[PDB]
Amino acid sequence: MQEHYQPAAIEPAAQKKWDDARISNVSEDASKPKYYCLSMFPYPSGKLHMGHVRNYTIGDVLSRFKLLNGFNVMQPMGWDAFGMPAENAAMKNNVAPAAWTYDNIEYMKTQLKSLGFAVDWEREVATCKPEYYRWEQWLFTKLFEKGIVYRKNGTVNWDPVDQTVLANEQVIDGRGWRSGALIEKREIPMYYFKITDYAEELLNDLDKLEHWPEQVKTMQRNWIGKSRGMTVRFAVSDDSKQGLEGDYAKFLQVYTTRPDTLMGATYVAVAAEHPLATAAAADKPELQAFIAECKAGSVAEADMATMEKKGVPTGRYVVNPLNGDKLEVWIANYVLWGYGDGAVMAVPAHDERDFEFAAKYNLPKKQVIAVGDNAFDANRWQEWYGDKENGVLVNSGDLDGLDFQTAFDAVAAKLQSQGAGEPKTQYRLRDWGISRQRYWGCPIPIVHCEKCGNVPVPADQLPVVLPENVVPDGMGSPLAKMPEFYETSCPCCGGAAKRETDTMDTFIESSWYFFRYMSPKFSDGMVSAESAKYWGAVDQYIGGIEHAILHLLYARFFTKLMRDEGLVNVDEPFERLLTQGMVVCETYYRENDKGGKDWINPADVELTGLPVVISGTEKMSKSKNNGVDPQELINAYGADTARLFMMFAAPPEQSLEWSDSGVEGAHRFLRRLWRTVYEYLKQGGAVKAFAGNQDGLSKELKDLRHKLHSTTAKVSDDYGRRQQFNTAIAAVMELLNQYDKTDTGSEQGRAVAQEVLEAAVRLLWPIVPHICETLWSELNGAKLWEAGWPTVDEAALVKSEIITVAADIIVVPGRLVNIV
């Protein structure tokens, strides 16, 4: 054992020792309890980020903890490899996205290996390989036959300068993000998953997930957005039927979740595309213009409520079926065609959006709900205006006095008795559109034939291979310009036919990769039956909150689809979910000649030519050029320091501030750990660790054993139960502090010192395995992973007794107890 801690010496040896042992290469071992720990696999975009290292260290702590506890742990890693970045690099550097993707995969793989993650690299998948994506093409074809996947026209944002389709997130005031040209809205046929057939299932099964953070579950419920409401029909007034045809000339139909307030309706609102808007706009240019601007909008869902609500009166009227009052129809920009009837009623007194809209336009507000003795002011919204549970009806004639549910059913009955309405269940959830007009993605296994239609590719013929010898240009997705790809024969009649050239939403790869890891070389299905039965579901999933809605929903959806096909036998893919925090860092800048700021990367500054300006701390990103390269942290200090800093700086959910002093402190503590073992061995070598009856130990050594087995209990509860790793590390530091202040020089003192150190290096092994593996080998000759996780010695927690009273009519505890 050298005197000085040199991580570049020991970290490669430990990694080779673990790999030669095949500790992380696992099989379907029925004689060991399985544990599947999974971190959200990365985009291979070149280099690991510091947040990558935080995520995968967290995964590795939990994985190593269960390993030391005797679990057969699978911790797989792979590459979410399709997507836009490789096409961007291919337009920048003039290389093939596949060449760029694979070179990044190899580099990032070395990075992960140098960090010592206990990963089964024999289960590695790369989603851009045909061996992977053939199976999602296969699932596509099966669902297409059942109609769960279907084709229908949708509207897209066509950028006419860049010559490709843009998401709403890439449209800024109607203009493409890069080009700057006005977007065109175009209707093209695309493919959809009928995820709405699974709405109630995906909502209800959320209640099974007792170990999910409740905010993730709440976000999923709000996204599915089930509600139980009422269809209500408002008869069109005789004076308003001009230009209307069909049922639109008879009535305006609306959906509402608050039919108990229908006596409170003071106007109604329709979508820009509603027939009443069309009929009203026919002789009114201002309505025509209002409709045009609504159609030309690109309000993304995540911004829908941040949009300013606007409308225009149409001059048409409808009749409330309950009280007969005539309501003017307004066209409103917040009423969305395709969500239900594309038309709503408005009750300004008991709906905040209606309150704000009515206040802007001085539309009337009519109270029909009362709560307690609260004051109703028609000018100031109050939160009790929208209370359902604790409200009573007023100004509603027959319905006065009723609560929410009873008035609901009474309104239902009144409407049904007139044939003017009926109860109705709705979902905000939209079907999942998966067509992308992109090259670097999984081809859609459909062939178009003029006689046979859209036909799925036979399974015998899958994969439809994406040709990798392609360099995107900047004038359409290449596939549409490659007859060598799309020209083919019809698999049903053999005639002249064309392959679909759109590719799949890349969320699709990430919706089932956790099952592929169970048998990533299985050539006869998505996942082998024997492996799916053994591994079951993911026990622990770790990933960022940015994937808590879409990706998790899609993964849960795919799991039920695969279950329904008989490929798996679980309802839910992920049992426990941990959301790790972002990583932040200072920013630096220097003003430029044009009155702006040029952002300086922290690696290119000298702290304390001419200096730059220190600025505000935010998430590491290419936005303000403030990303700290994890590889430089590894080269300077070793993987163990990097791992420790990230786990000590902050609890997992909290954002982690980059800290140069924090890194140095992490390294100093690893130095201290090394010196403590070295000095313990330099005095008189290793001994058998203390065990058994501790009667006759001195108080000082009993107190060290108390602190020791207390620390083991604390750290076990922190790894397993609370998943708070920073407090586990400080608890081991406190143990070493007490050891430092204990004379352990006697025969019994050495035996207790051995016990302390053998436990400490095992307790820290999931955090810093390279140095602990090395120190454990100097202290004990058994395999660390065979010694296993430290066990708590309950006797070491028994305090000495002191009638006689244990350490847990006057009466003073521990001096007397005057019976008076």
Ligand X SMILES: CC(C)C[C@H](N)C(=O)NS(=O)(=O)OC[C@H]1O[C@@H](n2ccc(N)nc2=O)[C@H](O)[C@@H]1O
Q: Which is nearer to Mg ion, 220 or 367 (CB)?
A: 220
> 713 touches which of Zn ion, Mg ion, ligand X, none (CB within 5 to 8 A by kind)?
none
- Cβ atoms of residues 100 and 755 within 8 Å: no
Could you tell me the smallest distance in angstroms from the CB atom of residue 723 to Mg ion?
A: 18
Q: Rule CB under 6 A: which residues touch ligand X?
A: 40-43, 49, 51-52, 54-55, 80, 510, 543-544, 547, 551, 620
Q: Is the peptide bond before 463 cis (omega within 30 degrees of 0)?
A: yes
**Site map 128..167 versus Mg ion, x via CB under 5 A:** ----------------------------------------
> 55 touches which of ligand X, Zn ion, Mg ion, none (CB within 5 to 8 A by kind)?
ligand X
> 770 touches which of ligand X, Zn ion, Mg ion, none (CB within 5 to 8 A by kind)?
none
> 49 touches which of ligand X, Zn ion, Mg ion, none (CB within 5 to 8 A by kind)?
ligand X
Could you tell me the smallest distance in angstroms from the CB atom of residue 689 to ligand X?
A: 39
> 452 touches which of Mg ion, ligand X, Zn ion, none (CB within 5 to 8 A by kind)?
Zn ion
Hey, which bits of 562-608 come out as E strands? Answer: 574-578, 583-591, 597-600
Could you tell me the smallest distance in angstroms from the CB atom of residue 190 to ligand X?
A: 21
Q: Which is nearer to ligand X, 541 or 690 (CB)?
A: 541
**Site map 160..199 versus Mg ion, x via CB under 5 A:** ----------------------------------------
Could you tell me the smallest distance in angstroms from the CB atom of residue 506 to ligand X?
A: 8
The answer to whether residue 493 forms part of the interface with Zn ion (CB under 5 A) is yes
**Residue given tokens 């436990």 in the structure block:** 759
Per CB under 5 A, the list member of 249, 492, 582, 792 interacting with Zn ion is: 492
Cβ neighbourhood burial of 694 (10 Å; 0-12, 13-18, 19+): middle
Could you tell me the smallest distance in angstroms from the CB atom of residue 437 to Zn ion?
A: 25
> 493 touches which of Zn ion, Mg ion, ligand X, none (CB within 5 to 8 A by kind)?
Zn ion
State the helix-helix crossing angle for 7-21 and 97-114, rounded to 10 degrees: 100
Tokens of 690: 């203390």
Q: What's the gap between Cα 106 and its chain centre?
A: 26
Distance CA 327, CA 269 (A): 10
Q: Which is nearer to ligand X, 52 or 316 (CB)?
A: 52
Q: Which is nearer to ligand X, 346 or 434 (CB)?
A: 434
Q: Which is nearer to ligand X, 427 or 513 (CB)?
A: 513
Distance CA 757, CA 710 (A): 14
> 808 touches which of ligand X, Zn ion, Mg ion, none (CB within 5 to 8 A by kind)?
none
- Cβ atoms of residues 474 and 162 within 8 Å: yes
**Strand pairing partners for 713?**
none
Could you tell me the smallest distance in angstroms from the CB atom of residue 39 to ligand X?
A: 7
Which residue lies nearest ligand X, judged by its C-beta? 51
Could you tell me the smallest distance in angstroms from the CB atom of residue 653 to ligand X?
A: 12
Contacting residues for 248 by C-beta, under 8 A, at least 6 apart: 236, 275, 276, 279
Distance CA 628, CA 201 (A): 43
The answer to whether residue 798 forms part of the interface with Zn ion (CB under 5 A) is no
How many residues sit close enough to Zn ion to count as binding (CB under 5 A)?
6
Q: Kindly report the CA angle at 618 between 615 and 623, in degrees rounded to 5?
A: 90
Q: Which is nearer to Mg ion, 16 or 211 (CB)?
A: 211
Hey, which bits of 92-242 come out as E strands? Answer: 149-159, 164-166, 171-172, 175-176, 184-193, 226-236
Q: Which is nearer to Mg ion, 91 or 206 (CB)?
A: 206
The candidate with the shortest Cα–Cα distance to 277, out of 326, 343, 356, is: 343
Burial string for 577-604 (b: 16+ CB within 10 Å, else e) reads bbbbbbbbbbbbbeeeeeeeeeebbbee
Distance CA 772, CA 670 (A): 10
> 492 touches which of ligand X, Mg ion, Zn ion, none (CB within 5 to 8 A by kind)?
Zn ion
> 225 touches which of ligand X, Mg ion, Zn ion, none (CB within 5 to 8 A by kind)?
none
Sites for Mg ion among residues 76-105 (CB under 5 A) = none
Residue type, 292: A
Distance CA 685, CA 332 (A): 83
The candidate with the shortest Cα–Cα distance to 729, out of 791, 802, 672, is: 672
Could you tell me the smallest distance in angstroms from the CB atom of residue 549 to ligand X?
A: 12
- Cβ atoms of residues 693 and 706 within 8 Å: no
C-alpha pair distances (Å), 594 with each of 590, 597, 598 = 12, 9, 11
> 236 touches which of ligand X, Zn ion, Mg ion, none (CB within 5 to 8 A by kind)?
none
DSSP class per residue in 793-813: -GGGGPPPP----------BT
Could you tell me the smallest distance in angstroms from the CB atom of residue 504 to ligand X?
A: 14
Q: Which is nearer to ligand X, 462 or 538 (CB)?
A: 538
Window contacting Zn ion (CB under 5 A); options: 416-424, 492-500, 533-541, 570-578: 492-500
Q: Which is nearer to Mg ion, 351 or 575 (CB)?
A: 575
Could you tell me the smallest distance in angstroms from the CB atom of residue 537 to Mg ion?
A: 11
Window contacting Mg ion (CB under 5 A); options: 31-39, 209-217, 383-391, 415-423: 209-217
Q: Which is nearer to Zn ion, 492 or 689 (CB)?
A: 492
Cβ neighbourhood burial of 377 (10 Å; 0-12, 13-18, 19+): exposed
Phi-psi category of 622—alpha, beta or left, where left has phi over 0 and alpha has psi -120 to 50?
Answer: alpha
Q: Which is nearer to ligand X, 266 or 626 (CB)?
A: 626
Could you tell me the smallest distance in angstroms from the CB atom of residue 51 to ligand X?
A: 2
> 499 touches which of Zn ion, Mg ion, ligand X, none (CB within 5 to 8 A by kind)?
none
> 759 touches which of Mg ion, Zn ion, ligand X, none (CB within 5 to 8 A by kind)?
none
Which residue lies nearest Mg ion, judged by its C-beta? 210
Window contacting Mg ion (CB under 5 A); options: 207-215, 253-261, 453-461, 592-600: 207-215
Could you tell me the smallest distance in angstroms from the CB atom of residue 209 to Mg ion?
A: 8
Distance CA 644, CA 769 (A): 10
Cβ neighbourhood burial of 383 (10 Å; 0-12, 13-18, 19+): exposed
How many residues sit close enough to Mg ion to count as binding (CB under 5 A)?
1
Could you tell me the smallest distance in angstroms from the CB atom of residue 539 to Mg ion?
A: 13
Q: What's the gap between Cα 689 and its chain centre?
A: 45
66 has binding-site annotation: no
Sites for Zn ion among residues 441-460 (CB under 5 A) = 449, 451-452
> 490 touches which of Mg ion, ligand X, Zn ion, none (CB within 5 to 8 A by kind)?
Zn ion
Tokens of 216: 């993730």
- Cβ atoms of residues 467 and 411 within 8 Å: no
Phi-psi category of 292—alpha, beta or left, where left has phi over 0 and alpha has psi -120 to 50?
Answer: alpha
Could you tell me the smallest distance in angstroms from the CB atom of residue 449 to Zn ion?
A: 3
Contacting residues for 211 by C-beta, under 8 A, at least 6 apart: 575, 576, 577
Q: Which is nearer to Zn ion, 449 or 732 (CB)?
A: 449
Q: Which is nearer to Mg ion, 210 or 383 (CB)?
A: 210
SS (H, E, C) 610-676: CCCEEEEEEECCCCCCCCCCHHHHHHHHCHHHHHHHHHHHCCCCCCEECCHHHHHHHHHHHHHHHHH
Cβ neighbourhood burial of 338 (10 Å; 0-12, 13-18, 19+): exposed
Per CB under 5 A, the list member of 126, 272, 490, 527 interacting with Zn ion is: 490
Q: Which is nearer to Zn ion, 23 or 492 (CB)?
A: 492
* Binding-site annotation: residue ranges: 622
Q: Where does this chain bind Mg ion (CB under 5 A)?
A: 210
* Binding-site annotation: residue ranges for ATP: 622
Q: Where does this chain bind Zn ion (CB under 5 A)?
A: 449, 451-452, 490, 492-493
